[PDB]
Amino acid sequence: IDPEKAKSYVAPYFEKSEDETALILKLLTYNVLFSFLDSRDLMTVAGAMWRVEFKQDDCIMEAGQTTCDKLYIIQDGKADIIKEGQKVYLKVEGTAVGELELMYQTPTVATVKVCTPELIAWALDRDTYRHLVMGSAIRRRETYIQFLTNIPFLSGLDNYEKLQLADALSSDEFEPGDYIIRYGEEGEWLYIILEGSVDVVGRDGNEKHVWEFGKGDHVGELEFLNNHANVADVVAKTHVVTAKLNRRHFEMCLGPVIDVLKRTSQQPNYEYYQSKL
Ligand SMILES: O=c1[nH]cnc2c1ncn2[C@@H]1O[C@H](CO)[C@@H](O)[C@H]1O
Ligand SMILES: O=c1[nH]cnc2c1ncn2[C@@H]1O[C@H](CO)[C@@H](O)[C@H]1O
Secondary structure, eight states: HHHHHHEEEEEOOOOOOOHHHHHHHHHHHHHHTTTOOOHHHHHHHHHHOEEEEEETTTTTOTTTTOOEEEEEEEOOOEEEEETTTEEEEOOOOOESSHHHHHOOOOSOOOOOOOOOSSEEEEEEHHIIIIIIIIHHHHHHHHHHHHHHHOOOTTTOOHHHHHHHHHTTEEEEEETTTTTOOOOTTTTOOOEEEEEEEEEEEEEOOOOOOEEETTTEEESSSHHHHOOOSSEEEEEEHHHSEEEEEEEGHHHHGGGHHHHHHHHHHGGGGHHHHHOOO
């Protein structure tokens, strides 16, 4: 995609009710594919979507076809991902199907079979997806996936899921002394430390040193798990490079390792954190 061609691309518009547009935007907001669009782009994308109904056992797309030039975001229902006759993944409400073929321009990798009495989805055509949504997804996936296969708490994600997490990550560089996370404030970001060291500075206020973390560790999830303001600062001790994830996408991206994060917070290195609770 030429950037100028993406700039001047006029998306189709398919009239729909205010209620349907609102429901679409809620789906686009939590789905990883759209994490970098601003409001006007989200509105345009929603205008280019149209509603599709499937009944149980329908194949939305079939492995090996080349004719499917669309993305589907699931509103209601579930679908099986079937490779070589085996169910290998389950797509639930709010997730998308078809993105791999739109990104990479290959034939349909897997068969997607509705396994609920009905499935209601919203479809998006190849050109709108490529011009308005894709952006630099392919570069983000290729960049981050080298680091993500070495992050301990992400072992519980399969390969497809690690790549999908890359869709919603964004990098930041910090300098010795920079506050990455600041006590008392609202948690919105989960940070993965790709390089450097950081200090967890708690309180009791009393400014008390809690723990030191480094390459491969994560910070910020405690506020996601338990919905409370930051119980501690996180301060760059060296130059730190991070990839971060917005709370929006916490469940969609890390669902399969949310249980590991719970265990981790019940370790002794969270004595400070246990006692505050
Ligand atoms: O390994 C997978 N894990 C999870 N979902 C997959 C996988 N492979 C494919 N899809 C889903 O099936 C669609 C059609 O091939 C893809 O676009 C993707 O949404
Ligand atoms: O007791 C602790 N031990 C280790 N890390 C902690 C502890 N408490 C908080 N954090 C880290 O600091 C962030 C801000 O609250 C938490 O989300 C977590 O990443």
